[PDB]
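Interim report, section 4.2 (structural modelling).
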Amino acid sequence: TELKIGNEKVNSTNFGDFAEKAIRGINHKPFVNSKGGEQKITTSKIRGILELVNKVYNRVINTNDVELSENILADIAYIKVKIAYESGREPVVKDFIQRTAFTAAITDVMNQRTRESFLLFARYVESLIAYFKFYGGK
Amino acid sequence: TELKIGNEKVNSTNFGDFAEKAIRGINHKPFVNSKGGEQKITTSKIRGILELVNKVYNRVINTNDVELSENILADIAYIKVKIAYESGREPVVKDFIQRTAFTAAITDVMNQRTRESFLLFARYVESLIAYFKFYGGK
Amino acid sequence: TELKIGNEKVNSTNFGDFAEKAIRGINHKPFVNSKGGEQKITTSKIRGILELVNKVYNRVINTNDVELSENILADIAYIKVKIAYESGREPVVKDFIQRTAFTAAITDVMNQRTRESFLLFARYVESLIAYFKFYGGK
Amino acid sequence: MKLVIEGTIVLKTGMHIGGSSDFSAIGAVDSPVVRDTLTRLPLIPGSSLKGKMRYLLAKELNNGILLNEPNNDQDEILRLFGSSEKDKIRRARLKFNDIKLSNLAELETFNVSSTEVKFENTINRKTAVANPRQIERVIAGSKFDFEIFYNLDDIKEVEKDFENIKQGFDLLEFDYLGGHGTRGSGRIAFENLSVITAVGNFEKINTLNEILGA
Amino acid sequence: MKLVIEGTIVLKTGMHIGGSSDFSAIGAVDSPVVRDTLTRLPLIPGSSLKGKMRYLLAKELNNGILLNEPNNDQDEILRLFGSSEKDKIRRARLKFNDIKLSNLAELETFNVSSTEVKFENTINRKTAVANPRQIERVIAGSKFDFEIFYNLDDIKEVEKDFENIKQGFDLLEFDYLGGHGTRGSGRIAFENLSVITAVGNFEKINTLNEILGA
Amino acid sequence: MKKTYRVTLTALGPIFIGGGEKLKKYEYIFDKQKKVAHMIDHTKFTKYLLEKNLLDDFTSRVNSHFDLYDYLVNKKGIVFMPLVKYSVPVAQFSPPMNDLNTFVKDAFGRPYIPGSSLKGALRTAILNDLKEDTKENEVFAHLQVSDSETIDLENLKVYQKVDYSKTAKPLPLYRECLKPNTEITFTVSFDDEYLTLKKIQNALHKTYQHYYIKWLKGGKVGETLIKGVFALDQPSQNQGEIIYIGGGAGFVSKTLHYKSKNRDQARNDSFDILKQLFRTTYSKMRSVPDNVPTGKHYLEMGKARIKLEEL
RNA sequence: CUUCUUCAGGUUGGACAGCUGGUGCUGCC
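Predicted structure of the assembly:
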């Protein structure tokens, strides 16, 4: 219930505000391309990241178990691997992950292993997508 | 009481009058889209707002704590995140969310962190939907 | 659920971290060749290896079996044949395979003969490649 | 005297019964299935099963047509499902129950959960653009053990009551239960239909089984 | 009544229908098929069949001009498929069901799986860059045995309904069922088409078969 | 309104299209005694290995080469028939099998040309008009191209790829192909409103002319005319019934700008666009002919014909 | 001994939203 986004602990009530801060910071000061250009992360890529989070959240949510089992933690480690792959492929995705603590959040969930920790992580990612849609637009 | 809105203050006695004023302001001068307007929000789009609020009202209506619990506060923050997200999807929803200052009321509820504040906010939203009814329809 | 590559490999909280540290150890000390080090083994050698592992994985996923059939075991044997040939082609593939214990993982999944170990090993190899792209490039 | 009608409801296709109480994320599910709040186990509400069975049976028994109000159905439906008419109140001889799924251990043997996610969409015939949804759905092969209470009031017309009970069950078998049935979902089957005495013993209880199993 | 429209659909070229909710791997498959959760068998969603049939029948019954809202179609389409038009809400006569793969035995003897993975390309005449994808397609040579229930609201509206159903099935023959159908995938053929009554017997049901089995 | 014009594929030339790749002779036999080649199945091979040497021992003996023509009958002395599915004769005109290409084949062994491959081919054919409608055009997004149908199994014949530039030097990559005089059929239908029979006839005629009279004659006469002639008949002007179906034939069929320009101008634009690709300068894209068993006949890999009939 | 391993859009949209019936009667000063 106490995520560790970056250097600031994230509780169960400031996920929306901190995700809004993350999106506004990226929107105000965006990533600079290698070839002297400006671009953001597309809605398709963040939607794919949310889908990845939705794959595991759809099975976690239909439970009352306090701690996630080994299969859920395996899927979370796999999602972290895919996060690393996306970061290594497109530098804008790496920038989006690094400006947030999406890797640090997934590592905190992996270390906590509790159901409520991943529930807060899903809330935070959902709010990131929400404030991308609100601020970035379409 | 003490529910800030942005330009005025709705106390526990003054939610219905403000809701009717906001609905009249909505009914007057409908929204302007790309094609000069002009359609108004649907009953099954303020639906979503109403069940979103009720999904916490049902859990707070039956209790006796003066201050809302960390689980209720998290769900109110999630309502704020959701209403931010869905406003970016449709503009005819965003004018409803802005002209009727939902976000300021939600933020004040999250700042007061009291049961009566959220009850007043829910009463305001319910009166808002009730007043959208009997003026429009469909 | 449990793999042996020399360092008590586990499905949960273990495959991604260990693949990442193997990739880092590869990159920390670049391979030594004649007469200059840092051969920079491209994705072309890493893919193809991934392609064989993933075609076997494609045939495995649509099979709900605790144990792998003899066809899948022969596919893993052909995987080992391809890896041995590719390593024999140039020494940098030998270094990549030996340091990441690809052959050890193949032998361990050949000994265990269960779908769980094969999916763990495929997940592990995908972790290797994802972290290679994350900490490397091209 | 009172009788208990046991039996199992087996899903043939995915079955979705709506009703939503909390926390529908923005990329995961848009219509969850009704679940037992404590155990999180999906259930078939007795209201929905009773309503669908009553609709099908009332339509079948009347003329094949059914446009009336529930308190003006046929006398068999009125006496078996109840009637709230002012001067003519029929007390229901059936008490449906909420039906939780029973073979969760059997499902876990197959390394699956009891619910799936179904991805649908609608295609606007103007622009051919798709609008995706995400329906939670209880997987086919799920089994729901049920119990219906029959209040044995009239000792003689119990046989006709049970023939109509079996007829309604069979109407459900060639129809759907809950949710988007016409679009593939909702198919069910009935098995192990057995009536037993709640307390004591009933003279025609071996007859009531053979008019339930056949 | 409860006429039951049975048959079999066979794929001539590999058909793709999505809706998986599993982790796509780095190089394994970028888009798998929709399958049953319990049996892991490829699935044809009765919603997909119903939607494609409604599109194809509606467009051919609208002089090749389909532009309206689904609830704003001709009367026959609504009375077969349903509509929530405000006053005269029409119940769908056709009850499609999620169609599961049937001929796994012959495929197993053929040493083949029910699905294959195809690599095609995303190449460009311009600066030479290709974006390879991985489409999982149900093997051509797959049989899906279906059962579509039917409601006989009026005896006048049975032969027209069934000839329209047959022509809707035969319009799918010169078309696909779903997925990347514009690019050589999804060709389907219907065989063993027929109909039977669920309960009892129906007069002139052979007229339905002579316009549905031929 | 949509109509049905059944079309066939008399693939008079051998075909190649990509669906995958395979490495050196580690699972296929390239014999040289009676000049035949072989490709293995899977399940029978698995059972054979199960009733023979262990899989790890099989693996531990690869040091490149590992040729399967001198091992299965010499180091094992057993019949190769249980491990062949589409065995195929080979005749070449001499640099050994460096690597082998795989035509795309569905799960039942059989070869076919998938959908969207014919869509790319018909894009480079019928897109002679404009160069803007590549995503939203109804000429394909309202067309319904289908897969190819059965391609025969007894018509497989391995062929050598050769060079045309003033010498017939063999090239390292070989490939099994489909022998000539084989007939394939389709069921490809289309509408009339936005793909008209007179329009398609005009399109095929104009593309055929702009290929033959404009480009092909200059290439044939530019470097060598006697190289093709052993026969090199190449029937022509027959209502435009020539299709370069498949691949491994040339870069002209990939880039479509020389059907609406002048020879010097089209070659100038081609030079401008190919300066960004590869570091070798060349006047034109040299051909890759083959040899058929002997009559030294050079034929471009991937020919076909077009014909339309009702129903 | 090469060259990308998927990219870009739609993430639910409308329709109904609680109706009918009872509604303190009897016993005591």
